[PDB]
Amino acid sequence: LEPFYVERYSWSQLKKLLADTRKMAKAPHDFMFVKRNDPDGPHSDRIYYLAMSGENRENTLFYSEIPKTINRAAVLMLSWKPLLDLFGIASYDYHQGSGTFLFQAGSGIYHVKDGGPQGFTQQPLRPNLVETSCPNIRMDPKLCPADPDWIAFIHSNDIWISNIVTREERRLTYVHNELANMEEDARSAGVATFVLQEEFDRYSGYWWCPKAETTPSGGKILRILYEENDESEVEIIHVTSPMLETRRADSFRYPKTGTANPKVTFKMSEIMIDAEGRIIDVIDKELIQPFEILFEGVEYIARAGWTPEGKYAWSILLDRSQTRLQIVLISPELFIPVEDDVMERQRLIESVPDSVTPLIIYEETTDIWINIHDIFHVFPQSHEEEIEFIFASECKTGFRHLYKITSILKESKYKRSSGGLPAPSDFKCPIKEEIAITSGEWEVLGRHGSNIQVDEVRRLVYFEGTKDSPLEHHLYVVSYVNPGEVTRLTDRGYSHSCCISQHCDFFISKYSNQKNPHCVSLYKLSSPEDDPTCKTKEFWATILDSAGPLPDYTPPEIFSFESTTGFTLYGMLYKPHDLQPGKKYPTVLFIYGGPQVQLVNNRFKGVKYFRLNTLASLGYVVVVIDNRGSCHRGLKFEGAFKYKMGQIEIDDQVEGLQYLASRYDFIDLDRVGIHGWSYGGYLSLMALMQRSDIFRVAIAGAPVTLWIFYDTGYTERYMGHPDQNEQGYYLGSVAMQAEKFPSEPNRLLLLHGFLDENVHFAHTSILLSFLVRAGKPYDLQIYPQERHSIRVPESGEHYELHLLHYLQENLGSRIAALKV
Amino acid sequence: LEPFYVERYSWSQLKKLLADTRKMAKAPHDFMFVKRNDPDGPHSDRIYYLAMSGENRENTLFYSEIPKTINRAAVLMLSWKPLLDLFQGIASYDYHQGSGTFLFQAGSGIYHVKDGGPQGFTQQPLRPNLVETSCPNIRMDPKLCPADPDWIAFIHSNDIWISNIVTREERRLTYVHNELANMEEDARSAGVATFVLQEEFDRYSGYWWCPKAETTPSGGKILRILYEENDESEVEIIHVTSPMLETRRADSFRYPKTGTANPKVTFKMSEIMIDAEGRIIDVIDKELIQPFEILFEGVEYIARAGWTPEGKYAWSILLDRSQTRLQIVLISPELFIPVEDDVMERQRLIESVPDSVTPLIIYEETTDIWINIHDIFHVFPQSHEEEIEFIFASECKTGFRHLYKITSILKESKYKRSSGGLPAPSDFKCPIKEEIAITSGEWEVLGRHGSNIQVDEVRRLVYFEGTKDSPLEHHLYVVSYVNPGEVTRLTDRGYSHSCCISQHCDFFISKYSNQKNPHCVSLYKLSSPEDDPTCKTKEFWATILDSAGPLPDYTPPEIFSFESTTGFTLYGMLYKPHDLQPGKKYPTVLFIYGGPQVQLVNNRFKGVKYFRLNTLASLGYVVVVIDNRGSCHRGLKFEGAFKYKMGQIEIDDQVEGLQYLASRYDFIDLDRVGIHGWSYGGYLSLMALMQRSDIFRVAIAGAPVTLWIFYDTGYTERYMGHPDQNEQGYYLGSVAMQAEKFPSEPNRLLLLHGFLDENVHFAHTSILLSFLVRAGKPYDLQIYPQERHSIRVPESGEHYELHLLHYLQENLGSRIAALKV
Ligand SMILES: O=C1CCN1c1cccc(CN2CCN(Cc3ccc(Br)cc3)CC2)c1
Ligand SMILES: O=C1CCN1c1cccc(CN2CCN(Cc3ccc(Br)cc3)CC2)c1
Ligand SMILES: [Cl-]
Ligand SMILES: [Cl-]
Ligand SMILES: [Cl-]
């Protein structure tokens, strides 16, 4: 077995090779189905969606016509009709009754009507700019669902509202002064703080009440539930600003693990409008008792909203350890006006009855961790003293499943008149019913756009899941009344990302597999006459057609092996291009390995991981293995590294690498490299530190070197509080074990974005500080204008060029063998 | 000629080699002579001085006895007597002659002792006496009051305080700064030199005691302190990462970048009334009768300041922004009035001051190149009321720094303040009665880095350091200031000397060395023949610090020189490879600084600071160092070569010098030349690779200036002018704007930078990297996370030396480096 050596290209030649092979647009998303209601016309629905028409284009609203019938011999490509004519849209709001779109595009907030009482346009609409007296950028605009004339938005960390008809603009909260410095004033209203956006994927912090309360005057009362945050006690850090000419650093509140999270509470803005759209008064209201007293043990407001009738506000609440979840109904009557006069304040507390109380309709615990998701459906309230809902959970079985729950809304044992504090279980509602809708060794999905859609007429629930395979997401449907058979609606051989129409007669799937790039197709749903419970599907039309299998991309093979740990572990193998018999090639292991991610699945990897194919063309074996802790395999699989991050991941990587090495003689174990970003860069350092016998080179991108520097929401979920896991934090932090790195140079390469807000450069800078003390060699590349991503394409081109060149000169080439 | 390939040591082996070969203390300095006045005793003087006793000991005060006579057959070694006892690191000290009071800071504490005064001379170590305080924070810059040695002054939280060391009274004089408030709002200070003044003009203090006390009718006195008051509110704020990397933070400070605002400055005076028993009566803070901008037209920087010997006038040396105009100005105490926010009382105090009292610009000069500030300025005792007599040094006349005796007429000004108009530029200018050149020639007098003059007013002589015999050696000279002609050299040739003359002018001490021999310190007695007091001879008296001798692990370089095509003789240093094999050519490593205010090539011992150039020679590298045009100690025309043109002329001299050696010596392999330097040296290392990639294979740039707009006002504008008036000078001189010119070959560029550098900020490197990334160019990078323009932690220095040797090995010297292309 002779060693294969890669072609030793120059720096200029590699740049040219990369540029030639480099020669993606956002696929259609955020779908919405509006009915035509026109018996004579040829179309049943109009679908609205966001997309990028090409690579250089901006993301904008489009529409397409869904025909009542189709020529089944042919295939129908729906044409993309532009909705707007502006002189970049991330999301949009819509009001069904009026047909009013509301969206932000650049600095402006705009509105237009389509598909309401005023009909359907046949050409692009010029949008109407919403007026404002506010100087700064307006964020997070939302239509009031009870009245489409009123919008809300955030400006300088305070909630405003504006009327698009009458032009009245009113500030609702006076919590932040923009002029003063952020050290004194660190309060905000209606905005999710850093940890909740970054680690819980909640981006909004205020919620319109869906219904208006009519007054005796002839006007009405609109309500806004919102989060008020106080970040005064949260640690401040200084990250370097993008304007490098201005040699300065921007401040922001980063709650590092162990330290204080923001001080949180619920508030409610009660807005009185008169008979013809004019504001009478705005009453800001607060909880009758403090947040800490009413919600014992709660750190995080994970999710929040309203019930369909607007009777209760709801919220999903977590404790600090993220092992307890509570779903709590909060009545508007629990809020009283904000008064500083102590005599007047005491009367308002007495005016609220003792029967009005927080209602904990669901509670659960786990020894592993609670994974927050977006699934939560509340049914219409039939009985006054009951509430019925669907929720998803891993806590019963260790796999996420849908459960139909009915909770009794008791009057509480605790009485506020006595003047005491409520015990832990005083607000807990008894569970009348708890039926499992789904079950098995597979999970229902509720993240990254995956959710349920409930058909209340047919009494069905649509959902995404891993039932047929952990490598493919599929759409399913099942009854929530007499749950039993789970009917798969998507075709095997692809992994699907689905969106179901609100009318439950259509669904769209964005699908791909290892060989075929992404397609988006529309499918019509229908039942047999004899049984509404049964659901069949039929292909209706293509929205986005694939270009076909790319001629200059060879996809990998998915393999698997039975681990000594007890689990089946899956991997991807890129064989070298033009594989010579009786020769062994250098091997680059690409890794992420952290939680909430799965690299190995049946999806098209030729866009995001296109350069793994490029490595194979140069003559590298490329391997990707999903170790224990990774996503879509249940909570027991995911819980393997609890309190133990860094300690088990590389065992699975080496085990899988040795499985391939014995089964394929062309893998040269003497020249194995490892590379990854974020958690991947972390594990790449751990790989070289723990197993220098296996791994010759390690290229660590944006590595977490020191877990005390990372945030609360993430780190405490998987590693607990630093005091309760002294050893896990030490053993899991590579910066603390600098002496264990090799004394040989050309084995360690550190890559980091200089302006990184998530994984700060200090992780690298402190690692380097200890590497200097330990007398250890290292290589370093900095990307001075990057923030945990590739904003500027030149820095991405330079990264790719350097990595190929580094792997060439220190792993693959003939010179690399001579250099040792 | 075969190429020599250096031995390919591993990383662990080079660490061992450097650890073994690594196996210094401050030599005696800040000397002072005090006479015994004891006829029966054997000693004439006692010398006090600061010195480090050994390798790992603190810097502290010592004394030695100077005997009246010596055995001229023998060589006397003076023993070091410790002045101070061990406490329950002294950088400098004050002394008061009439009382014998020492004052000095040692750690946080300010201490005092007494010796050599009326109370006599100790024969054992004195216990230091702490100056007690109620101030919460570290006290800075303590100074004895020359008028009354009971009083001291110091800075605390950017304000001036005074403390009586006998009565223990303590008082704050200025209320300009608020320690509790943040620096964005409160950017004012008093008695403190700001960043640019400390870093670019070597002024470390911002307040000056008046040396005489005005007596009152009551039987008390008035003490006075002149001080600078700075307002840094409009100055650019920058954030450098704090030493504590645990808290992901950056410390703010005021950095006036080129072309932006310097601090708003003015003179103030604290009038301090003391009663008959040493108690403070009152403190009156006082300000200039008109603003600083009105009285001192065109002035940006207060370069130097102080008082005349009688305390009649305060003086100051003032520069304009371009640094092409110097002004020496006398400022009377009567120009200051008390601070009064009341509008009617303020107007009455202005009217009480006469119109005759006015600023007195006793000297002015200009230049098309630049003003180099120095510490030479000597005011004689005032004989006539309408005259002032003084010695000063300048390059403005001839282009070399020389001493000039000047007499200026103190004219009552034409401008009158009662008219209510602003003065014209020349209204405060004094006429020059006399301007006699004391020295002259194609060589300079030295007035910086400790070099100054000693003026014997009895014999009417002036001692000074200069470059008359050679630009490669510093020497002590003496000459009359009445009838200047003969310049007598006092120090011996073959060494470069650094000298301190006694206040009595009958002794001098010289710290001397040469390329072959380490540093010595020796005492020399001065005397004259009875017939001619002008004629000065010297005689070795005693050794203070004996040399360790030429240690066996260091082979020093040979000083060479070549006649350049530019018309200047350019000097250099050459380290030949150790065990030089015949018929072989070795890889070369050019070490460079090449910026202004520095000379690397001279006849001094280089085996301490540049020990590792010898280590590079031992591994088999040729090491070259060349003082290009712009460097120090060769006159102002030589220095002015790169005005507006930094980065453009320096590498021509480096390559020309390299090619001189290449023709003269066949052992220099021009195919394998490396370049390396720190600061301006790192800047030129980049420029060398950028411009002459044909000559230089590798460049190792340390803390490089990559963008001149990022560097401060005082330095950049002196050499390059204002950015607006020299757009292409700044462009051509900034490597970050010319990133496309770097090589596409990797393993040729290595950047080194201290992450916490406050002088040449890491931003220089990060913005260079920004443009290198855009241009698609390769680079190597090493950061030192806990360093700031120096090596304070030994581990970072050890890592630097290891990586540098290994980099040169793997990408220049070794056999594998040749195959790697
Ligand atoms: O911070 C910063 C600065 C850049 N960056 C950052 C951080 C996290 C993720 C990503 C995006 N991944 C980059 C790596 N990609 C695979 C890949 C393998 C081999 C080769 Br060759 C090229 C690409 C997947 C996407 C970038
Ligand atoms: O910033 C920073 C961080 C370090 N640093 C900095 C900046 C300016 C000056 C100096 C001190 N010089 C360091 C280099 N020395 C010659 C030398 C050549 C080869 C070898 Br190998 C070792 C030493 C002379 C003294 C250090
Ligand atoms: Cl079931
Ligand atoms: Cl129902
Ligand atoms: Cl000694």
Ligand SMILES: [Cl-]
């Ligand atoms: Cl003369």
Ligand SMILES: [Cl-]
């Ligand atoms: Cl005289």
Ligand SMILES: [Cl-]
């Ligand atoms: Cl010019």
Ligand code: NA
């Ligand atoms: Na996110």
Ligand code: NA
């Ligand atoms: Na200095």
